[PDB]
Amino acid sequence: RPTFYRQELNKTIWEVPERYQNLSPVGSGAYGSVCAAFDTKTGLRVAVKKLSRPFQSIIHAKRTYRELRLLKHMKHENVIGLLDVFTPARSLEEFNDVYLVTHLMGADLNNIVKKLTDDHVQFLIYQILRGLKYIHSADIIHRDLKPSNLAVNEDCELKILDFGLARHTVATRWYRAPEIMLNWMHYNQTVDIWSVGCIMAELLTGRTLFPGTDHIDQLKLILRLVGTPGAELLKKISSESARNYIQSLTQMPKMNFANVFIGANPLAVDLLEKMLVLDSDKRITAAQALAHAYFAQYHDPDDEPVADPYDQSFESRDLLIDEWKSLTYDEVISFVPPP
Numbered sequence: 001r002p003t004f005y006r007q008e009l010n011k012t013i014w015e016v017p018e019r020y021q022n023l024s025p026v027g028s029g030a031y032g033s034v035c036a037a038f039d040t041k042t043g044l045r046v047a048v049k050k051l052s053r054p055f056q057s058i059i060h061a062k063r064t065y066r067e068l069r070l071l072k073h074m075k076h077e078n079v080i081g082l083l084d085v086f087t088p089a090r091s092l093e094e095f096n097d098v099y100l101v102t103h104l105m106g107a108d109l110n111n112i113v114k115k116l117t118d119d120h121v122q123f124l125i126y127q128i129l130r131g132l133k134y135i136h137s138a139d140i141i142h143r144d145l146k147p148s149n150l151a152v153n154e155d156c157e158l159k160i161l162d163f164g165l166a167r168h169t170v171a172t173r174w175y176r177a178p179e180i181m182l183n184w185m186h187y188n189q190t191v192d193i194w195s196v197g198c199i200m201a202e203l204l205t206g207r208t209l210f211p212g213t214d215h216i217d218q219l220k221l222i223l224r225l226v227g228t229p230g231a232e233l234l235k236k237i238s239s240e241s242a243r244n245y246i247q248s249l250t251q252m253p254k255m256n257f258a259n260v261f262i263g264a265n266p267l268a269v270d271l272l273e274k275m276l277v278l279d280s281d282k283r284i285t286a287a288q289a290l291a292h293a294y295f296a297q298y299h300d301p302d303d304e305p306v307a308d309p310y311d312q313s314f315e316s317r318d319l320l321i322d323e324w325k326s327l328t329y330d331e332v333i334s335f336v337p338p339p
């Protein structure tokens with residue numbers, strides 16, 4: 001067991017092993033805060049996330065376990081990976097803090113918002129899709145893919161995060177598939193493809209594709225581009241609510257993408273058409289997307305791995321805070337560094 005040292009940073013205390021030196025806030029947002037640090041053991045710059053109030057409620061407790069489980073499972077170059085997980089706690093009894101350690105990338109994608117070259121886009125989107133392929137094959141939907149959940153280093157290497165930064169040391173709806181806002185019962189994986197579509201579009205135009213002021217506005221903007229649902233899509237809408245609002249709207253046609261994405265690489269345009277289909281069953285999957293001609297210079301089908309099966313059974317479990325806590329504690333304890 002390493003030696004820990006305390007340190008007040010933000011308004012919070014960081015009790016980290018000395019192994020990690022020179023902590024400095026990158027900022028924070030939803031569910032914790034992150035410090036850049038130096039890993040004296042690997043010589044590598046790392047990001048250290050301290051979970052905020054990891055066991056506040058059953059919900060936080062479960063969210064903390066879910067993140068630890070997710071992270072411990074993600075073993076892919078385009079997906080945030082766990083270098084280390086530790087807690088000051090010597091025992092389950094005093095376990096109330098969780099620090100997750102990952103590679104410091106140094107930037108996220110709204111950090112290039114203030115138009116990329118087609119080659120940069122191409123490379124970034126490839127990497128997103130490559131990470132998504134992997135994520136999706138573990139039966140995991142990200143559901144919140146947006147620029148801030150995409151960490152990029154100086155080499156333009158990208159890892160998908162689920163904890164984006166909000167405070168650095170301005171809207172989530174802009175990337176969400178339309179179904180997520182019609183509050184659909186069950187989302188499929190290609191909700192994430194839609195967000196990629198939005199992300200790609202934004203990288204090529206330097207403009208937020210659907211900068212909806214709200215969920216109604218958002219949906220209005222989406223339909224403006226992709227046109228109202230055809231009766232084939234309508235057929236699949238159980239929500240009499242949704243179905244009502246939908247077929248009452250302006251019957252917009254699908255725009256010509258080649259015209260909206262003027263002078264974009266027509267390969268990119270074609271991928272965007274594939275990604276930004278309202279009907280999620282008809283959206284290109286991340287795997288299919290990796291094959292698309294747009295990524296010919298990056299696509300390698302023998303190096304686009306899928307994940308080991310991810311045991312998501314816990315998600316349906318309703319447990320006591322101390323059970324989530326103790327399950328998280330077991331996860332912290334069972335953790336084995338990458339080689």
Ligand SMILES: O=C(Nc1cc(Nc2ccc3c(c2)OCc2ccc(OCCN4CCOCC4)cc2C3=O)ccc1F)c1ccccc1
Nearest residue numbers: 026036047049067070080100104105106107108161162163
């Ligand atoms: O990804 C999940 N959990 C999870 C997320 C993170 N999140 C990270 C990590 C890294 C980074 C980051 C967010 O934000 C983007 C960013 C922005 C700026 C920056 O450096 C800018 C400041 N520099 C410092 C050095 O150079 C001079 C100034 C670095 C980074 C960065 O590198 C960290 C650990 C986790 F554990 C998850 C997964 C599943 C479920 C729930 C959450």
Ligand SMILES: CCCCCCCCO[C@@H]1O[C@H](CO)[C@@H](O)[C@H](O)[C@H]1O
Nearest residue numbers: 070074079080140141142160161162
């Ligand atoms: C490492 C990158 C993978 C991204 C984490 C995917 C999270 C998938 O897990 C999901 O999280 C949702 C919100 O996060 C919850 O509402 C869902 O119940 C849960 O299934």
Ligand SMILES: CCCCCCCCO[C@@H]1O[C@H](CO)[C@@H](O)[C@H](O)[C@H]1O
Nearest residue numbers: 178179186187188236278279280281
């Ligand atoms: C104007 C609102 C139109 C939005 C239509 C969203 C349709 C997304 O696609 C739908 O996803 C469902 C699961 O999420 C699937 O079960 C359906 O097969 C698929 O049609």
